[PDB]
Amino acid sequence: SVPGSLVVVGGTYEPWLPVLEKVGWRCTQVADLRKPDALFVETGPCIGIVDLSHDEFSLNGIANLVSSHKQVRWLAFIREAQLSSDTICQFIVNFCIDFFTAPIPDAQLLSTIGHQLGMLKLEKKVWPHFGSAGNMGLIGESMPMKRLRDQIKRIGPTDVSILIYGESGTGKETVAKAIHKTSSRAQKPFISVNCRAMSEKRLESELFGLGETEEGQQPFLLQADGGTLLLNDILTLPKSQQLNLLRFLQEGTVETRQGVRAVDVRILAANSSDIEKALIDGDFNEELYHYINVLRINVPSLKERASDIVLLAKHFLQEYSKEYNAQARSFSDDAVRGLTRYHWPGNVRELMNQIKRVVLMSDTVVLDESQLDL
Amino acid sequence: SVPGSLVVVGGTYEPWLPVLEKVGWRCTQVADLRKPDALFVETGPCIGIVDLSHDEFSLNGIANLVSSHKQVRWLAFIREAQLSSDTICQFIVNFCIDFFTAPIPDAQLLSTIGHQLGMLKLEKKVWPHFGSAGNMGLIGESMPMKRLRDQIKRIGPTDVSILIYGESGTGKETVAKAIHKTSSRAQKPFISVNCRAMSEKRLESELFGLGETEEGQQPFLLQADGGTLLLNDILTLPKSQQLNLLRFLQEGTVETRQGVRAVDVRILAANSSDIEKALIDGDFNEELYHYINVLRINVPSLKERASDIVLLAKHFLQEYSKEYNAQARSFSDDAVRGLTRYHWPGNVRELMNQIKRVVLMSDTVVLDESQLDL
Strand partners, A296: A163
CA distances from B111 to A103, A119, B7, B50, B166 (A): 17, 15, 21, 18, 49
- Judge whether B115 is closer than 8 Å to chain A, CB to CB: yes
Residue B143 backbone phi and psi in degrees, to 5: -115, -45
d(CA B223, CA B371): 44
Whether A295 sits inside 8 A of B90 (CB atoms) is no
Whether B119 sits inside 8 A of A59 (CB atoms) is no
SS3 B6: strand
d(CA B88, CA A157): 8
Whether B316 and B171 have beta carbons less than 8 Å apart is answered as no
Residue of B nearest to A285 (CA): B147
In terms of DSSP bridges, do strands B162-166 and A4-7 run parallel, antiparallel, or are they unpaired? Answer: unpaired
Interface of A with B in 334-353 (CB under 8 A): 343
Number of A to B CB contacts under 8 A, please give it: 180
- Judge whether B273 is closer than 8 Å to chain A, CB to CB: no
Residue A191 backbone phi and psi in degrees, to 5: -135, 115
Residue of A nearest to B87 (CA): A157
Whether A121 and A1 have beta carbons less than 8 Å apart is answered as yes
| Residue among A63, A85, A279 minimizing CB distance to B160 | A63
- Judge whether A65 is closer than 8 Å to chain B, CB to CB: no
3-state SS of B227-288? CEEEEECCCCCCHHHHHHHHHHHHCCECCCCCCCCECCCEEEEEECCCHHHHHHHCCCCHHH
First to last CA, chain B: 61
SS3 B145: helix
What single string gives the DSSP state of each residue in B163-216? EEEESTTS-HHHHHHHHHHHSTTSSS-EEEEE-STT-TTHHHHTTS---SSS--
B95: phi > 0 → left, psi -120 to 50 → alpha, else beta; which?
A: left
CA B151-B156-B159 angle, 5° bins = 135
Q: Looking at beta carbons, which residues of chain A come within 8 Å of B186?
A: none
Element (H, E) at B297: strand B295-299
Closest CA to B324 of B358, B370, B366: B358
Element (H, E) at B298: strand B295-299
Whether B233 and B196 have beta carbons less than 8 Å apart is answered as yes
Q: Please, what's the b/e burial string for A10-36 (b: 16 or more CB within 10 A of its CB; e: otherwise)?
A: beebeebbebbeeeebeeebbeebbeb
Whether B73 and B93 have beta carbons less than 8 Å apart is answered as no
Residue B80 backbone phi and psi in degrees, to 5: -125, 155
Element (H, E) at B60: helix B59-68
Closest CA to A252 of A283, A273, A218, A226: A226
SS3 B295: strand
| Residue among A88, A111, A184 minimizing CB distance to B87 | A184
Whether B347 and B301 have beta carbons less than 8 Å apart is answered as yes
- Give the list of residues 6+ apart from residue A181 with CB closer than 8 angstroms, or none: A156
Closest CA to A266 of A368, A350, A191: A191
3-state SS of chain A? CCCEEEECCCCCCCCCCHHHHHHCCCCCEECCCHHHHHHHHHHCCCEEEEEECCCCCCCHHHHHHHHCCCCCCCEEEEEECCCCCCCCHHHHHHCCCCCCCCCCCCCCHHHHHHHHHHHHHHHHHHCCCCCCCCCCCCCCCCCHHHHHHHHHHHHCCCCCCEEEECCCCCCHHHHHHHHHHHCCCCCCCEEEEECCCCHHHHHHHCCCCCCCCCCCCCCHHHHCCCCEEEEECHHHCCHHHHHHHHHHHHHCECCCCCCCCECCCEEEEEECCCCHHHHHHCCCCHHHHHHHCCEEEECCCCCCCHHHHHHHHHHHHHHHHHHHCCCCCECCHHHHHHHHHCCCCCHHHHHHHHHHHHHCCCCCCECCCCCCCC
Q: How is domain A158-298 classified at the architecture level of CATH?
A: 3-Layer(aba) Sandwich (3.40)
How far is residue A199 CA from its own chain's centroid? 29
Where are the CATH 3.40.50.2300 domain residues in chain A?
A: 4-126
- Judge whether A57 is closer than 8 Å to chain B, CB to CB: yes
Where are the CATH 3.40.50.2300 domain residues in chain B?
A: 5-126
Mutation to test the A interface, candidates B78, B142, B154, B159, most A Cβ within 10 Å: B159
> Yes or no: is domain B5-126 CATH 3.40.50.720?
no
Q: Looking at beta carbons, which residues of chain A come within 8 Å of B148?
A: 280
- Judge whether B71 is closer than 8 Å to chain A, CB to CB: yes
Whether B298 sits inside 8 A of A160 (CB atoms) is no
- Judge whether A68 is closer than 8 Å to chain B, CB to CB: yes
Closest CA to B273 of B354, B339, B196: B196
Q: Looking at beta carbons, which residues of chain A come within 8 Å of B262?
A: 56
- Eight-class DSSP state of B343: -
- Eight-class DSSP state of B73: T
> Yes or no: is domain A4-126 CATH 3.40.50.2300?
yes
* Entry resolution (Å): 3.2
Whether A159 sits inside 8 A of B87 (CB atoms) is yes
User: Count of CB atoms within 10 A of residue A81's CB?
Assistant: 14
- Eight-class DSSP state of B5: E
CA A210-A214-A217 angle, 5° bins = 95
Closest CA to A43 of A58, A28, A55: A28
Strand partners, A77: A49
d(CA A157, CA B87): 5
Element (H, E) at B336: helix B332-341
What single string gives the DSSP state of each residue in B10-32? -SS-GGGSHHHHHHH----EE-S
CA distances from B167 to A49, B20, B271, B272 (A): 41, 54, 8, 5
Where are the CATH 3.40.50.300 domain residues in chain A?
A: 158-298
Sign of the CA dihedral A239, A243, A248, A249? Answer: positive
Helix, strand, coil percent content, chain B, rounded in steps of 5:
40, 10, 45
- Give the list of residues 6+ apart from residue A370 with CB closer than 8 angstroms, or none: A358, A361, A362
Q: Please, what's the b/e burial string for B188-222 (b: 16 or more CB within 10 A of its CB; e: otherwise)?
A: bbbbbbebeeeeeeebeebbebeeeeeeeeebbbb
Closest CA to A16 of A2, A30, A27: A27
Where are the CATH 1.10.8.60 domain residues in chain A?
A: 306-359
Q: How is domain A306-359 classified at the architecture level of CATH?
A: Orthogonal Bundle (1.10)
- Judge whether B279 is closer than 8 Å to chain A, CB to CB: no
d(CA A180, CA A173): 11
The CA R_g of chain A, rounded to the nearest whole Å, is 25
Residue B306 backbone phi and psi in degrees, to 5: -65, -35
User: Count of CB atoms within 10 A of residue B3's CB?
Assistant: 23
B106-111 contact pairs (CB < 8 A, 24+): B107/B19, B109/B16, B109/B19, B109/B20, B110/B23, B111/A111
- Give the list of residues 6+ apart from residue A180 with CB closer than 8 angstroms, or none: A186, A190, A227, A228, A266, A268
First to last CA, chain A: 49
d(CA A8, CA A14): 13
CA dihedral A273, A274, A277, A281 (to 10 degrees): 10
User: Count of CB atoms within 10 A of residue A105's CB?
Assistant: 10
Burial of residue B234 (CB within 10 Å: 0-12, 13-18, 19+) is: buried
Mutation to test the B interface, candidates A158, A251, A293, A297, most B Cβ within 10 Å: A158
Whether A237 and A284 have beta carbons less than 8 Å apart is answered as yes
- Determine the angle formed by the axes of helices B306-323 and B332-341, rounding to 10 degrees: 120
Whether B355 and B315 have beta carbons less than 8 Å apart is answered as no
CATH class, domain B132-298, is alpha beta
CA–CA min distance B198, chain A (Å): 26
Interface of A with B in 293-322 (CB under 8 A): 294-295, 303
- Give the list of residues 6+ apart from residue A35 with CB closer than 8 angstroms, or none: none
Number of Cα atoms under 13 Å in the Cβ half of residue A342: 21
User: Count of CB atoms within 10 A of residue B181's CB?
Assistant: 16
- Judge whether B185 is closer than 8 Å to chain A, CB to CB: yes
- Eight-class DSSP state of B370: -
d(CA B31, CA B35): 8
User: Count of CB atoms within 10 A of residue A355's CB?
Assistant: 22
A24: phi > 0 → left, psi -120 to 50 → alpha, else beta; which?
A: left
| Residue among B93, B119, B297 minimizing CB distance to A98 | B119
Whether A279 and B147 have beta carbons less than 8 Å apart is answered as yes
CA distances from B267 to A34, B156, B157 (A): 17, 13, 13
Whether A64 sits inside 8 A of B294 (CB atoms) is yes
CA distances from B80 to A50, B89, B106, B110, B312 (A): 31, 9, 17, 17, 55
- Judge whether B52 is closer than 8 Å to chain A, CB to CB: no
Q: Looking at beta carbons, which residues of chain B come within 8 Å of A119?
A: 92, 96-99
Q: Looking at beta carbons, which residues of chain A come within 8 Å of B115?
A: 98, 111-112, 115
- Judge whether B251 is closer than 8 Å to chain A, CB to CB: yes
Solved using = X-ray
Amino acid at B44: G
What length does chain B have?
Answer: 374
CA–CA min distance B290, chain A (Å): 8
Whether B206 and B172 have beta carbons less than 8 Å apart is answered as no
Amino acid at B310: V
Closest CA to B230 of B202, B199, B195: B195
Q: Please, what's the b/e burial string for B269-295 (b: 16 or more CB within 10 A of its CB; e: otherwise)?
A: bbbbeebeebbeeeebbeebbebbbbb
CA–CA min distance B12, chain A (Å): 26
Q: Looking at beta carbons, which residues of chain B come within 8 Å of A89?
A: 122, 125-126
Whether B192 and B266 have beta carbons less than 8 Å apart is answered as no
CA A314-A315-A318 angle, 5° bins = 90
- Judge whether A93 is closer than 8 Å to chain B, CB to CB: yes
